[PDB]
Ligand binder design. Structure first.
Ligand SMILES: *[C@@H]1O[C@H](CO)[C@@H](O[C@@H]2O[C@H](CO)[C@@H](O)[C@H](O)[C@H]2NC(C)=O)[C@H](O)[C@H]1NC(C)=O
Ligand SMILES: *[C@@H]1O[C@H](CO)[C@@H](O[C@@H]2O[C@H](CO)[C@@H](O)[C@H](O)[C@H]2NC(C)=O)[C@H](O)[C@H]1NC(C)=O
Ligand code: CU
Ligand code: CU
Ligand code: CU
Ligand code: CU
Ligand code: NA
Length: 499
């Protein structure tokens, strides 16, 4: 069952064995992935998060981010530790009370403390549209049509060296999959369809790092949503999905009744499908209960290319149709050396006082804010352009902006910008050497918004900056509840921190 929009959510430690290997984890709702949190567009969500964690090897504090939800007027509820709140301590709870006006689509939630979401605190978050403009394109859209793709590690996150190339031990599809080494024939996930029906498959990357080449043998996929943004229909036979991205696609159950492999090949870790790694099963009702015998093609003839995507609505692009054609045009210098990432020469290390609390306490320019050099102010009601030229080691880096979606004016592997009709999204691969992926948005959401690579190991190694959007209006726009004001005193007392 789905939970929400008003629900408790307990965060616990437990042993799990999603690939046959037992390890302890950090779980929401007792499962991996966590339960789907759902509601309708414009609903009030009140997710009261109970921190019941006791195992220090995965951290006993926590904080949860609602990925892709704008949090307008509720910056305090966004979740990134030391940007919008101090962590919740064990034995305490916290009500994330916010609204989702003007958004409908496929989202997710995850820990936003250190690399803790890798240890298991990740699940889907779906905002349905009762008047969806795509409703007539499918018959079925429910918890059974969500497909999660996850990397899974046998080593605990807090034992992963910072700045290292860290590699997973299994790909999990809907929570199940097989280990790359010492492979055992542990259970594979089954997605069941009825011959003749059309399904809205909601594909969610809950990855901490790899991108996946996702396909379904015998089937093609008609994209209708990208990171929450409705798209024109685009039919493909393969989707390369980067960490934290989401797609909805229509699956037409139009092939013979039978069993078909679902494939998710990561860019690192185990390559191929030997022993049923990187796999799940699409089963038609009435098929024999047995593994598929289907083949992938040698090459995919209609892969997703990001410039082929276009919004369903006439979203356009803000600003003027040339590089630098914005009120505030920025170019970030994105680098890596010696185990640490940097943006504009500064490696991100979380501050002691969350950025939002520094601003509410009266710090009002970005040079007054900590960490020094890690906060860039944005002016209000302005067109922002951010160029993100690639080249830093460990790519391709999927960059994500909190509080906003953005027009993808230039995509990976294509030097031509699009000032007319590019897709809007919230997490974008910045590509490869020489690329110049560029995003645009308008500043209508006061508060401090994190910008970072969504490979969680990279964020931990410093690949982040904070956009302090409309500092002067942050306090009036974002009134804070007493429980939020209580978080830093409680956290600092528990950890013997003076501030
Ligand atoms: C990416 O595009 C940005 C513009 O969006 C380029 O920025 C210019 O950089 C040159 C020096 O490299 C400066 O003289 C200009 O002031 C910048 N802004 C402009 C022209 O509008 C950046 O060079 C591009 N990077 C790559 C690798 O192609
Ligand atoms: C590279 O990106 C550009 C810009 O998004 C793509 O160019 C568009 O191509 C479409 C489809 O043919 C045309 O309708 C548009 O007029 C083009 N726009 C511009 C500004 O040129 C281009 O197709 C992409 N390249 C590849 C190989 O997909
Ligand atoms: Cu996220
Ligand atoms: Cu986010
Ligand atoms: Cu990265
Ligand atoms: Cu984030
Ligand atoms: Na425009």
């Amino acid at each position: 069952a789905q939970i929400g929009p008003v629900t408790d959510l307990h965060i616990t430690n437990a042993n799990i064995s999603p690939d046959g290997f037992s390890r302890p984890a950090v779980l929401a709702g007792g499962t991996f992935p966590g339960p789907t949190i759902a509601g309708n567009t414009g609903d009030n969500f009140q997710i009261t998060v109970f921190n019941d964690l006791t195992d220090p090897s995965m951290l006993t504090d926590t904080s949860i981010h609602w990925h892709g939800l704008f949090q307008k007027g509720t910056n305090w509820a966004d979740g990134p530790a030391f940007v919008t709140q101090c962590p919740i301590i064990t034995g305490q709870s916290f009500d994330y009370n916010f609204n989702v006006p003007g958004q409908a689509g496929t989202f997710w939630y995850h820990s936003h403390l250190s690399t803790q979401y890798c240890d298991g605190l990740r699940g889907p978050f779906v905002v349905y549209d009762p008047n969806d403009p795509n409703a007539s394109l499918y018959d079925v859209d429910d918890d059974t049509t969500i497909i999660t793709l996850a990397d899974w590690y046998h080593t605990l996150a807090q034992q992963e060296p910072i700045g290292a190339a860290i590699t997973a031990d299994a790909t999990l599809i809907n929570g199940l999959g097989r280990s790359f080494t010492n492979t055992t024939a542990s259970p594979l996930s089954v997605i069941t369809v009825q011959s003749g029906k059309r399904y809205r498959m909601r594909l969610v990357s809950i990855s901490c790092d790899p991108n996946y080449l996702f396909s379904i043998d015998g089937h093609d996929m008609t994209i209708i949503e990208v990171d929450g943004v409705n798209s024109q229909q685009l039919t493909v036979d393969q989707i390369q999905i980067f960490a934290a991205q989401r797609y909805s696609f229509v699956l037409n159950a139009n092939q013979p009744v039978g069993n078909y492999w679902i494939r998710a090949q990561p860019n690192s870790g185990g390559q191929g499908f030997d022993g049923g790694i990187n796999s799940a099963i699409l089963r038609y009702e009435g098929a024999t209960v047995e593994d598929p015998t289907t083949t992938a093609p040698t090459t995919f003839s209609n892969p997703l290319v990001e410039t082929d995507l276009h919004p369903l609505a006439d979203l356009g692009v803000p600003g003027q149709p040339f590089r630098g054609g914005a009120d505030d045009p920025l170019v970030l210098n994105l680098a890596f050396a010696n185990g640490r990432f940097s943006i504009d020469g500064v490696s991100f290390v979380p501050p002691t006082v969350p950025v939002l609390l520094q601003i509410l306490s009266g710090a009002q320019n970005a040079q007054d804010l900590l960490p020094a050099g890690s906060v860039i102010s944005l002016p209000s009601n302005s067109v922002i352009e951010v160029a993100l030229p690639a080249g830093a080691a460990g790519g391709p880096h999927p960059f994500h902006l909190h509080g906003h979606n953005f027009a993808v004016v230039q995509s990976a592997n294509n030097a031509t910008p699009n000032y007319v009709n590019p897709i809007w999204r919230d997490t974008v691969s910045i590509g490869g050497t020489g690329d110049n992926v560029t995003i645009r948005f308008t500043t209508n959401n006061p508060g401090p918004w994190f910008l970072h690579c969504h490979i969680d190991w990279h964020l931990e190694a410093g690949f982040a900056i904070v956009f302090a959007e409309d500092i002067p209006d942050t306090a009036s726009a974002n009134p804070v509840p007493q429980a939020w004001s209580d978080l830093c005193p409680a956290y600092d007392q528990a950890h013997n921190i003076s501030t």
